């Protein structure tokens, strides 16, 4: 037991509240999953039959599941691996959904850049723009690009052969792993 194992989530690490997700660790059988800063009791309730296979399913995720997780195998007694890279499990749907629009239009010419605006009716110190992959690439708004209840993002160059699907979220930095309901899906339509 030496090499740090791999920790991941299926279908992904950004899950809508109430939906299922399975955290998985792979390195032989003595897997140990844990949440940083605050213990996560659900882990202790996973049947050993699944733990031995590095499977930690969450049938219906709740706000309480959100957090930064790591995994390792072995033990102090028998020796243990380094902890895996961190997995930030995010649960969405905690706040009113923001509005995401393309400036000046969702319809853009190939090779161009477009400005996306995520607007909220309630103040939030955090804004995230996620490009729905095909895992989705989620990025925090830049310091220079966010107001008290709004954030701007610049995407591009765009091309017709690639898909441009986005959704944004607002959140409170004191609970960085709990996001708002997602904004309606924004689909950029690249002419050409």
**3-state class (DSSP) for residue 126:** strand
Pairing of strands 107-109, 189-191: parallel
Look up residue 95 and give its two tokens: 């706040």
Solved by what technique? X-ray
Domains 1-92 and 93-192 share a fold: yes
CA–CA distance, 66 with 57 (Å, rounded to integer): 14
Is 2.60.40.10 the CATH number for 93-192?
yes
- What burial letters (b/e) apply to 44-66, b meaning 16+ CB within 10 Å? eebeeeebeebbbebeebeeebb
In the block, tokens 């792979």 appear at 26
**3-state class (DSSP) for residue 65:** helix
**Alpha carbon distances (Å) from 93 to 18, 100, 132:** 9, 16, 17
Closest among 105, 104, 115, 112 to 154, alpha carbons compared = 115
Phi, psi of 42 (to 5 degrees): -60, -35
Give, as one character, the DSSP assignment of residue 18. Answer: T
User: Would you say 62 and 91 are in contact if contact means Cβ atoms under 8 Å apart?
Assistant: yes
Give, as one character, the DSSP assignment of residue 84. Answer: P
In the block, tokens 């897997």 appear at 31
CA–CA distance, 154 with 119 (Å, rounded to integer): 15
User: Can you give the residue ranges of every domain in the chain?
Assistant: 1-92, 93-192
Closest among 117, 133, 122 to 168, alpha carbons compared = 117
Look up residue 148 and give its two tokens: 């008290």
Look up residue 169 and give its two tokens: 């979220």
The CATH class for the domain spanning 1-92 reads mainly beta
CA–CA distance, 20 with 54 (Å, rounded to integer): 17
Resolution in Å, one decimal, please. 2.1
């Amino acid at each position: 037991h030496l090499p740090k194992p791999t920790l991941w989530a299926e279908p992904g690490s950004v899950i809508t509240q109430g939906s299922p997700v399975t955290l998985r660790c792979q390195g032989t059988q003595e897997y140990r999953l844990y949440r940083e800063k605050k213990t996560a009791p659900w882990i202790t309730r996973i049947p050993q039959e699944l733990v031995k296979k590095g499977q930690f399913p969450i049938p219906s995720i709740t706000w309480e599941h959100a957090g930064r997780y790591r995994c390792y195998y072995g033990s102090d007694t028998a020796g243990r691996s380094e902890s895996s890279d961190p997995l930030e499990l995010v649960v969405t749907g905690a706040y009113i959904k923001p509005t995401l629009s393309a400036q000046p239009s969702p319809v853009v010419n190939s090779g161009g850049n477009v400005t996306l605006q995520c607007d909220s009716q309630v103040a939030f110190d955090g804004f995230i723009l996620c490009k729905e992959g095909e895992h989705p690439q989620c990025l925090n708004s830049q310091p220079h690009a966010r107001g008290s209840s709004r954030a701007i993002f610049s995407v591009g160059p765009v091309s017709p052969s690639r898909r441009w699907w986005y959704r944004c979220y607002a959140y409170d930095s004191n609970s960085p792993y709990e996001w708002s309901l997602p904004s309606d899906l924004l689909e950029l339509l690249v002419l050409g």
